[PDB]
Design a protein around this nucleic acid. Structure first.
Lengths: 64, 206, 146, 58
RNA sequence: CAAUGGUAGGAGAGCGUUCUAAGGGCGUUGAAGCAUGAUCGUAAGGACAUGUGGAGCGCUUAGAAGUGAGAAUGCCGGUGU
RNA sequence: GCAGUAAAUGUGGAGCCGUAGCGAAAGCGAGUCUGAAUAGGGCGUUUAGUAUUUGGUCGUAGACCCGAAACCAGGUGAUCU
RNA sequence: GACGACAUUAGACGAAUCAUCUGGAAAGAUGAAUCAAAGAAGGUAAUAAUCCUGUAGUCGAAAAUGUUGUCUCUCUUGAGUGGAUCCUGAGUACGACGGAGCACGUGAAAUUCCGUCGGAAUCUGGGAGGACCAUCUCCUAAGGCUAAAUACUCUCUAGUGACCGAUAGUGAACCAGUACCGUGAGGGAAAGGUGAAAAGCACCCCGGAAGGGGAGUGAAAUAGAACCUGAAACCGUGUGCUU
């Protein structure tokens, strides 16, 4: 039948123009007293899913 | 371009002009082949099926205990290795038809009608005029027109008497101008089109 | 081409790889699945995204954002896509739908500015960008927002 | 065990726990045995206490 | 002029079995099977002759698959020690 | 869906993909987001896509075959004990 | 009830081929014809459009049915305008507690149900528009009936199949849910093929018989009833070369 989508993932990544996936960052919910001011604005950004993980999850997000 | 119009007798009457965008293109053998495969696949009423290990009668009891007997471990008398057991992955009821883009379907009818106009197998006749069904007379017409054992006759709309006359001549099929199909034009070694059907086929296919 | 001499298009067809039929084929005994483990079993393999119990990527990462159930996104027509019309000619959304430059009016029409006019004409759309406005007015012609 | 007037009867559902663990349960009507006038001649029958809230003659 | 051991494994080219479409053929002046033979190709394999056999079956091109067995203490049937 | 022969095919243009991306969003647009910046940086911008289909994989299906210890529902049984 | 109309549970008619060759027999081969609204198909001593049953086409019911045109027949009020009053579905809506359902986990559950307690309004009203309200828009619950498009095939009728051809295809092509097994629920097999025609071997010989060997039937009897073809494992009898 029609293949489904990892709904848990569709809420975490936006698809970018060259087919990349823009992801949000980790280590950013609490315990900020234990992380530096440098770590915090360099975590206030967006990175791309690394190609190794892309090879792992290509189909979980095929319809995005 | 200009094909000779003959009478049912074979004597030249007039001449008609069929376009080269319909009856004179360079045949695409890649598109014509895919269209022939499609039609032959679409004709398969696949109604072929077998029974797997769930549909064979009975077979629910472990035939013997798992350990202790010296026999191989078995779970049903209807397993695939058993005589009388379920089939693994055989035929299942399915269809075989597919589709091609519309424009490609049109280049395949044109390509078949252009092959049968390069090999000189397109005889445009003026009309047909059969006022009652008689087969012996349709054989006389196709022999006086020197048409090969295999010919496809094309009328304008449904011509009841022309159809009832060629149903039994072995090797002749009768088709309307809209019901032209590739498998039929490509089997036929010769064509015989009514001038009205020839102007209709130029309008529709180009 | 004759029905008894036909040929398929070159390189268009290929015979598929039957597995588990003799050693010579190169996929004889194990059918290309190695020796043991889940990969070697029927219906085996592992669910995609699974990482051997390691926390999967898409739970290491946080969700963000929402969806504004009511978006106004428009079928966009670029500046250079308007030089398929003519001079002075009074284009409209219906006219450009007929011309087929827009396959469907999604929630309106938006003119953006990329190329050039080479023309002088009036327009009537739903929304415009600044560049569209100056690019139309430079050559002359109005833009009646509807 | 139905009421001869309304029809309020028993119904099944789930006893749920704090951990949302479910067990099947039932809900019965407050059926009371009362002597009412069935077709004139008095007779004892089960009738709900909501049907006796207002409307029944014992 | 250089290269050619090879297992898990990747790639390519192919040989065979049944059926279908078309074309072209063979068949009581003996088909398919079966048996024998000292024959041909690089291999999967292909012919030819002679016997038994008493009716169907090849070849070319292309399509589809219940397509290839030596092992599963495999299943069924025969026959050994 | 309709016509058609259980075919081709014709008709059917809701939809579907692409021609513009950026941002959580409002929104803006060859730019956009962060930001006070006209800084810097992220993603873009230099057109090529789409329909069908052969092949390779993967998902959902029992999904290469065989094989448990076992679980649950409805029945049968105190002629042995 | 009373008249018709096609269709369906028997059926009827239905074109056109002869000769030679090989053969046990031709439908084959060869030559010369013919019909076709019929060259679908199955038979026939081999492979048949013209031999047979049929096919295309046409025709056809005493009756007993579905079906349908009508004729009856049986039923029977259609509107507007005011609007002062009146009426418009109660233990109901709905709320609280506890549950189910709705893609959505007593929860916002509004939409919606069930149990337990409460419990309303009557147009100057009531419900809905995803907590929600105010306003707007839509609707008018708590009574009832309703064909079509839709799902399925124990059957029956006609037909189709790049579906199986007896370890396949139904378990079952064959007296099969039967031998058989079990106290019972149940479980469950194996097993088609002489030839064209039974022409199924008159008599004789050995033998008690089973068998056999002649003769005869047949194209063929290593086609003789366990009967078409008859592989391999396996068992024999000879021997050329070896030990």
């Amino acid at each position: 039948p029609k293949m489904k989508t990892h709904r848990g993932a569709a809420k975490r990544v936006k698809r970018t123009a060259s087919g990349q996936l823009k992801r949000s960052r980790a280590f950013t919910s609490h315990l900020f007293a234990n992380k530096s001011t440098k770590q915090k604005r360099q975590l206030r950004k967006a990175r791309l899913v690394s190609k190794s993980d892309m090879k792992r999850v290509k189909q979980l997000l095929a319809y995005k | 371009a200009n094909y000779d119009v003959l009478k049912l007798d074979g004597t030249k009457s007039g001449s008609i002009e069929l376009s080269d965008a319909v009856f004179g293109i360079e045949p695409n053998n890649s598109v014509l082949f895919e269209a022939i495969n499609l039609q032959r696949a679409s004709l398969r009423q696949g109604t072929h099926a077998v029974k797997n290990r769930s549909a064979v009668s009975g077979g629910g009891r472990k035939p013997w205990k798992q350990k202790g007997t010296g026999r191989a471990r078995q779970g049903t008398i209807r397993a695939p290795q058993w005589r009388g057991g379920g089939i693994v992955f055989g035929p299942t009821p399915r269809s075989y038809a597919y589709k091609m883009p519309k424009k490609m379907r049109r280049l395949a009818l044109r390509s078949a009608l252009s092959f049968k106009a390069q090999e000189n197998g397109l005889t445009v006749v003026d009309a047909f005029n059969f006022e009652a069904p008689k087969t012996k007379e349709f054989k006389n017409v196709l022999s006086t027109l020197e048409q090969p054992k295999k010919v496809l006759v094309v009328t304008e709309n449904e011509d009841v008497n022309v159809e009832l006359s060629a149903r039994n001549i072995p090797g002749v099929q009768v088709t309307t101008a809209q019901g032209l199909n590739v498998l039929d034009i490509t089997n036929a070694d010769s064509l015989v089109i009514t001038e009205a059907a020839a102007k209709k086929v130029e309008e529709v296919l180009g | 081409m004759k029905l008894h001499e036909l040929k398929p298009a070159e390189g268009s067809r290929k015979e598929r790889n039957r597995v588990g039929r003799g050693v010579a084929t190169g996929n004889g005994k194990t059918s290309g699945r190695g020796h043991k483990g889940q990969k070697a079993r029927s219906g085996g393999g592992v669910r995609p995204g699974f990482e051997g119990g390691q926390l999967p990527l898409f739970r290491r990462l946080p969700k963000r954002g929402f969806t504004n159930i009511n978006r106004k996104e428009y079928a966009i027509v670029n500046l250079d896509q308007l030089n398929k019309f003519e001079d002075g000619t009074e284009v409209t959304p219906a006219l450009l739908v007929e011309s087929g430059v827009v396959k469907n009016e999604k929630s309106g029409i938006k003119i953006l500015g990329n190329g050039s006019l080479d023309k002088k004409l009036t327009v009537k759309a739903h929304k415009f960008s600044a560049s569209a406005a100056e690019a139309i007015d430079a050559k002359g012609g109005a833009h009646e927002v509807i | 065990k139905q009421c001869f007037v309304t029809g309020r009867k028993a119904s099944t559902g789930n006893r749920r726990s704090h951990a949302l663990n479910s067990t099947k349960r039932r809900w019965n009507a407050n059926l009371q045995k009362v002597r009412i006038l069935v077709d004139g001649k008095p007779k004892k029958v089960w009738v709900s206490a909501r049907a006796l809230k207002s409307g029944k003659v014992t």
